[model samples]
Target: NPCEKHSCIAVIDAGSTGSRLHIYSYDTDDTNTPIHIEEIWNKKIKPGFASIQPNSVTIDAYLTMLLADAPIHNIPVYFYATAGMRLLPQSQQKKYYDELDYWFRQQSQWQLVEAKTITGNDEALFDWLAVNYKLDTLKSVQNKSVGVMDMGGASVQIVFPMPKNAEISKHNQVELNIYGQNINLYVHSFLGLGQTEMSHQFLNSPSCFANDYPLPDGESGQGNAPSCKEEVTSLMNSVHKVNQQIQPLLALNPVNEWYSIGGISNLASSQLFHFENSELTNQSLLQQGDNQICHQQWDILNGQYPDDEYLYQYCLLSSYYYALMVDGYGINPNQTIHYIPPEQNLDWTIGVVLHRA
Candidate 1:
């Protein structure tokens, strides 16, 4: 079997909020399931600034910490970078890339494969895999069609498939799935709507924040005046625009379910209730309360995944599988076999493997 003696493979997911490392033990006989070995290490170092200035300091610090704990030497290490690295200036990105390459060469004996960026389409596919695998909805949704949306701290992705197993090309290629499979989904990325930006948009909109909802903290004068409402309103408007654009595309296909994922999908349901309350007034308790609105509520409103750890883990694993499947179909030399190192942070990155025997 393909996985008979193959050692466990490591996968890393680096994003704006954090990074994660996952190790998977493949079953040569059965590609569907693999044994979970152990989550050796994880580190959470804020690399947001690293994007503007790609340097080894932040990543090196985290990597050093991880090595100290896990110390899996001489294994093949696969690296994948996301929005944070992709959004950086070209020179900075290259600089960081070079630094990472140098570090990998000098550090442990692991083979450090060239790191690649995950695209918007790939992000959508990850959401789809996560939802389908974790929610037990694949059988029901496969070929039948559905919409998948992933809204993150820095960007948003919306995707819908035209057909199953169709080759995703440059004109349409998104992020690579975990299985290396090309998820034939129509993908789109919306820039400038990350959590921080959205929060700012809400605080600046005077019309939407006019009611009892207090303005965002740290505002100078008129703290009572709703300041962040504009951002929320603008974000909702963007959601509507996305829905409008996706409606026609999905209409061609017989899709029944809509799936969503991302860091914002896990907020408490009660928060949605308050936000959706039409009768909310300036003097309403819901507005005056100190409870902050959950970001997941926004996902629900925009047809995205629920905010849950189980679901998130499922997405991460399934995304990896999907990427593997896509790579298998590609003609590139590296397509034959690949690995993704575990992220420095996140508990689920360890003990997950995928291999084609």
Candidate 2:
């Protein structure tokens, strides 16, 4: 019935940790862009789309479990995979896609649009679009600059307003016309800088772990946030050149507001941490993590907070966030950064609906 008056579509976030399906319905505005978008159904499954075997039976079961239960049939679907699929080699990625293509061919109810691993750059643009759309800023022109950051498991992305620069790579800049407004943004994604990927390289670093925590290299955790930040800053500044790549541009074109998605939300919302109004400051985050989780003894803290699975990584994640936002992007430590609530489970799929090709 909703589809009779409003257009409906299904978008899948095939992410590293899991696959989430979102069914959205919306009516077009005067400009014929999707507006008043509402999610009608949502389903999440474990083990990312790319993690499973690509055999016909496995693929059939996965697709059936994902799509067969949706109430709406004969709607267009977008099966966009993120960092998990990006990690695969092209040869290996082809196997999943080939099987997915075949599965869709057999289905009559769910129409497949395009399913592929999107680049981080494109993902960054969608991050900006989805957040700004939710903020109600995309429909009209605004003077303030809004930035979006997606801190995922395998990659991290940052996007904000910037005039297209001849000096910047064409791939990193995106120009868009939406809701009768012209928008230009600079986007970049840092591969292997995501929390999980970056953690692998520093699992042995004592400063990055909780006090007395066991390290893989037979070293006990020392857990100093400032020291952990220093260690992460080195990796961001030296090898990734996050500072060189991001700081100057951010300096020249300052972002008035910063919004973030992904793991940061879960960490900020945990009982071990206290952030006000769904917002956090880099200075406060580092200090809190250092004083509470990092400096605390591993056994005592672990026993105290049995439910918080991510409590162990708060020290490292907080330190890394400061390193990325303050040291690398050159944002002031005192600046307030807002995050979407973890319970909302917001992703970039809404952007796909608004910017359909």
Candidate 3:
């Protein structure tokens, strides 16, 4: 096996929509941080772990279905659930973990080290680590401050370089010594602001949908990107206080480059949009959504992009991103934002492996 001579562990990122299992082999350097980390096998199963019933029979079946096909075993595993599980009550979450613990105790092949729902701040830390690890920027100090945003179904996270702040809660800032360098980051996750959750509140807003698109309230969509963005911005600023919480910090400690994962990557990389070098600007994205999908007739778009199931929501998604980034975070509309390719399947689990204690 590829991991025979190397340290190996399984990291499962149980997200809102699905759970992804990644088996990685790596060698830790002198500082005990993983290096030369490589993924040996990866698989994603639909219907998130939190979505399943937590009874023994159901949990066993789900576990079997998720792990039965892996090529390697006999490794320690970290099963970390994200925002989907975060949305659940603590009582509900406990039931799933209890069943998971029992299932792991009954097996010796795949030893479970930890099975718990991770906080959004921890998830944000991993998001930053994973992206910086991928970019090969973690090993040495750099001049630019890199920021990462992970937009998921249930919550969205933003983390960037900053000095530890006494005014902020201890939970929002993290300091890590990795690869012998000190790293400080400011992290926050906005629950109910992710695409799916936020959409629930704005589903009736006509300006956020395609022209002639039927709304749940029987109102036809008359998509307008600017107007749609304004609507979303109101939610971000007034309802969630995103601007109040994030804008000033970011204004003082600016992120030189921005990278994003999750829904934004999916939307920006779609055939309906045009971007150069895997990067996009909010101005261009809003314009494209307005011109290509928003103002276009729903029937024509549905007929034109039959296979693109997410095509219908591009208008709303585009406007929401702009609202979150520009209006909420106070980023310039013309700033370039790099996104990981959707096909690459890069995620925060790798951060788990590297930051393993």
Best prediction by lDDT: 3
* Decoy 2 TM-score against native: 0.98
The lDDT, on a scale of 0 to 1, for candidate 3 is 0.92
What lDDT score is found at residue 345 in candidate 1? 24
Count of backbone collisions in candidate 1:
62
User: What are the runs in model 2 whose C-alpha is more than 4 Å off?
Assistant: none
Ranking by lDDT: 3, 2, 1
Q: Each prediction's Cα lDDT score?
A: 0.44, 0.90, 0.92
Encode model 3's per-residue lDDT on 1-357: one tens digit a residue: 666789999999898888989999999898878898888899989898888898999999989999998989899999999989988999999999999999999988898999989999999999999999999998887888999999888899999999987888999999998999999999999989989999998889999889999999899999999999999999999999999999899889998999999899989888999898999999999999999989999998899888888898999999999999999999999999999998887888888987765
* C-alpha RMSD (angstroms) for model 2: 1.1
Clash pairs of candidate 3? none
Candidate 2 residue-wise lDDT, 1-357, digit = tens: 768777999999999888889999999878978888899999988888888999899989988888778888888899999988998899999999999999889868888999999999989999998898889998777988999999989999999999989988999999999988899999999989999999988889999889999999889998999999999999999999998889889889999999999889988888878998999999999999999978989999999978877788899999999999999999999999999997876778888988776
Model 1 lDDT per residue over 1-357, tens place: 322465566667777666656544433333244433434444444444344345677657766654555545556666666677667667766776787787797765667764666665555555555444444443342445555555566666655666542533454543333332444556666555444334444443323322232335633222221233323433444553544444455556534544444432332122332423111222222233212221122233224435532321221222222221122111122211111112212222231232221
| Regions of model 1 farther than 4 Å from truth | 1-7, 29-43, 47-53, 56-59, 136-143, 164-170, 173-183, 206-244, 269-357
- Local lDDT at 311 for model 2: 81
